Amino acid sequence: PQITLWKRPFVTVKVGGQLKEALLDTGADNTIFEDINLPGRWKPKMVGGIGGFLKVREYDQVPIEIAGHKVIGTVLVGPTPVNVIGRDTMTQIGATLNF
Amino acid sequence: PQITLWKRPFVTVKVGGQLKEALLDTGADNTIFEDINLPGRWKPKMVGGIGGFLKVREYDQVPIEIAGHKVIGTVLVGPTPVNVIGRDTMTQIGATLNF
Numbered sequence: 647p648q649i650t651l652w653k654r655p656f657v658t659v660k661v662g663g664q665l666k667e668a669l670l671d672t673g674a675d676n677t678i679f680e681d682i683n684l685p686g687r688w689k690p691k692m693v694g695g696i697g698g699f700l701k702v703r704e705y706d707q708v709p710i711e712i713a714g715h716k717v718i719g720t721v722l723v724g725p726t727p728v729n730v731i732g733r734d735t736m737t738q739i740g741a742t743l744n745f
Numbered sequence: 746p747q748i749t750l751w752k753r754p755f756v757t758v759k760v761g762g763q764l765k766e767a768l769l770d771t772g773a774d775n776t777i778f779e780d781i782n783l784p785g786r787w788k789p790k791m792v793g794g795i796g797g798f799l800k801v802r803e804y805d806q807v808p809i810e811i812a813g814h815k816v817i818g819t820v821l822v823g824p825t826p827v828n829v830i831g832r833d834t835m836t837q838i839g840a841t842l843n844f
C-alpha cells in the first residue's frame with residue numbers, strides 16, 4: 647500500500663505465530679513488542695529512546711509477516727509503550743518513504 | 746524523493762532561520778527539535794516514548810521549510826537526543842510510506 651500519515655500507521659503483523667498490531671516507525675532502528683509469547687531463551691539487550699534506556703529481551707530468527715511478506719528477523723520484547731516495527735524489519739519488506 | 750530505510754532517514758529542514766537535520770519519523774506524532782530559538786509564545790507539554798517522558802515547549806503555528814516547502818504548524822522544543830519530523834508536519838507535504 648501507499649500509506650498517508652493522518653493517523654498512526656498501525657499494521658497487522660503475525661509475529662512468531664500470533665496476530666498482533668504495531669506501529670510502522672521510521673525513527674526506530676529496532677522492532678519491539680511488549681508481551682508476545684516467544685519460545686525459548688532470549689539474550690539481554692539495551693535499547694534507547696527519548697526518555698532513557700531500557701533492558702529488553704532479544705529473540706533471534708523470528709518469523710514476521712507484514713502485508714503478505716514473510717521475513718525472518720530479530721524481535722525485541724520490552725517495555726515500549728507501543729509495539730513498533732523498526733527499520734530493521736521495514737528494509738526487509740522494501741518499505742520506502744516518499745515525498 | 747524516494748527514501749529507503751537502510752540508514753536513518755535524515756532530511757534538511759530550515760527552522761527559526763537555521764538549517765537543521767531531523768529524522769522523517771512516522772512513529773512520531775509531533776516534530777521535536779533540541780536547542781532552537783523560536784520567537785512566539787510557547788506552552789508547556791509533556792511527550793512520552795521509549796524510556797519515559799520528555800518535557801518540551803510547544804510552539805504553535807510555526808513556519809518550517811522542509812525540502813522546498815513552507816510548512817506552518819506545531820513544533821516542540823526540548824532535550825531530545827535526535828530531532829524528529831513528526832506526522833503532523835509530514836502530512837502537510839504529502840509524505841507517505843510505501844511497500
Ligand SMILES: COc1ccc(S(=O)(=O)N(CC(C)C)C[C@@H](O)[C@H](Cc2ccccc2)NC(=O)O[C@H]2CO[C@H]3O[C@@H]4OCC[C@@H]4[C@H]32)cc1
Pocket residue numbers: 671672673674675676677678693694695696728730732770772773774775776777792793794795826827829831
Ligand atoms: C508526540 O510527539 C512525539 C512523541 C514521542 C516521540 S518518540 O521519539 O519517543 N518516538 C515515539 C515512538 C517510540 C512510539 C518516536 C520514535 O521513532 C523514536 C525516535 C527516537 C530516535 C532516537 C532516539 C530517541 C527517539 N525512536 C525510538 O525510540 O527508537 C527506539 C527503538 O529502536 C531504537 O532506534 C532509535 O535509535 C536508537 C535509539 C532508538 C531506539 C516523538 C514525538
